[PDB]
């Protein structure tokens, strides 16, 4: 009397996330046929790691956890197990320690709409807007940066107003955050050349320890902590405390996009994590 897991219905949902905002669904206490599943989704490839694929048939699991996202065409090879490419460094790490299977499938492009969303709350706090891209453009991060909850990317207006040369943009930082660190420097034809942190940018930072944005490979189960921001593009020149600290659109670095479409279908990936083989009530009915 347990219901069908309906895994195919979720995989075939026309709202497909990108790797940046990959979607997990946990299936449990339900019946499924792997044989039917591989037919109802236009499967290109299904294979398993740390697990004998033939053993799914007729088995029960505590739960089955799927993580899905559309594939940017140029980055498909990033999904090879252990790949150091962009997708697994900075969007979704395929855990090689679990019992897992990797599914490559596709949907007719005419129905798919890619849902792009930046999961980083600190990016969004400092002005990251919804993406404005074509409906099959798939966003992926190239670099992720983590920050403390006290992070603010803007120089302090009162510091900037003392800079005679190379004034940084400035704005008020939210209550509970710390202003961007800056120093007045001497260069051979300027005596108040202000130099702040994360220069030239967080990706190429000369002094990574002094840059508050910390390069962060995604861990198992994690989303990108955030795109790095060019702090010279957060705030405004001569910005006072009456301006709220925000970063311009071009301040957010180290991300790209590509279409998922080839031969009029959008290519999609789902990871499968098999939890607790020979227990629970997530059961294959393939042998019944």
């Amino acid at each position, epitope marked *: 009397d347990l219901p069908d897991c309906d895994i195919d219905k979720w995989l075939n949902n026309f709202n497909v996330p990108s790797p940046l905002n990959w979607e997990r669904k946990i299936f449990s206490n339900c019946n499924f046929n792997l044989s039917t599943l591989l037919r109802l989704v236009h499967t290109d490839s299904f294979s398993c790691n740390n697990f004998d694929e033939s053993k799914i048939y007729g088995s029960c699991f505590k739960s089955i956890v799927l993580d899905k996202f559309a594939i940017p065409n140029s980055r498909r090879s990033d999904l090879q197990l252990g790949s150091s490419g962009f997708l697994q*460094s900075s969007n979704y790490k395929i855990d090689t320690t679990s019992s897992s299977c990797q599914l490559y499938y596709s949907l007719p492009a005419i129905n798919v709409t890619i849902n792009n969303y930046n999961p980083s709350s600190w990016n969004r706090r400092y002005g990251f807007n919804n993406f404005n891209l074509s409906s099959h453009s798939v966003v992926y991060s190239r*670099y992720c940066f983590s920050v403390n909850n006290t992070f603010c990317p803007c120089a302090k207006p009162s510091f900037a107003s003392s800079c005679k*040369s*190379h004034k940084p943009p400035s704005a008020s930082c939210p209550i509970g955050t710390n202003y961007r660190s800056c120093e007045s*420097t*001497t*260069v*051979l*034809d*300027h005596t108040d*050349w202000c*130099r702040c942190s994360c*220069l*030239p940018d967080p*990706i*190429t*930072a*000369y*002094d*990574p*320890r*002094s840059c508050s944005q910390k*390069k962060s*490979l995604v861990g198992v189960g994690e989303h990108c902590a955030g795109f790095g921001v060019d702090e010279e593009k957060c705030g405004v020149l001569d910005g006072s405390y009456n301006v709220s600290c925000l970063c311009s659109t071009d301040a957010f670095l180290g991300w790209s996009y590509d279409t998922c479409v080839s031969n009029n279908r959008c290519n999609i990936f789902s990871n499968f994590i098999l939890n607790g083989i020979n227990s629970g009530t997530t059961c294959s009915n393939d042998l019944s």
Partner: antibody
Amino acid sequence: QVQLQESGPGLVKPSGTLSLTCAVSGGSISSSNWWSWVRQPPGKGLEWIGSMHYSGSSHYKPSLKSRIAMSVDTSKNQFSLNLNSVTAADTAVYYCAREGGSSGYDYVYYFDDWGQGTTVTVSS
Amino acid sequence: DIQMTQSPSSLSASVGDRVTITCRASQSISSYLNWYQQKPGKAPKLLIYAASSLQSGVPSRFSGSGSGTDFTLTISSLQPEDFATYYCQQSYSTPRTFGQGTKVEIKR
């Protein structure tokens, strides 16, 4: 193919100003490279003293901050070092070097294409 | 400042020996670690950058390993022209800092 060449007077009087220039060939000073000075006192190891990018951003050895300044000249493809109020503690071989980043995720800066060095003696 | 400490400070080896030099940073510096060779009367020369990347043109008998605080330079088969002082250097922070140097002497 980046090659560097130091120039400047080797003898500086005590409390005088040391001024060195480094001319860059085979590559543009206007690039992602930073440009660096590293000195080596007699019988001692290596001590970085400063680096600067053509945007004007710079970092110096903190104990020298009150005496040191660098410049990057995009019109001559050169960069320079000024060290004020010198004493015998500043006698050394001064090398210029390219400080560029690696192509990995970490973008690790390293020194490369070192100049041959110029010997500076602080003496009356 | 991040202090870099090399071990040993000097060593003597024969042609064809494996030479091993280690370097420790006073705090973690991930892979921001470079190795230089300085021969008598010459400027330092880059051997290894980013802890394990061999500089183009440098013989493959040189190799680096490590991450965090502890790093290793290995010369797989010492040659006479490898007489030099070797330096590690971190670029995770400012100021840039160098290890004290390790002198490699050649026994013959």
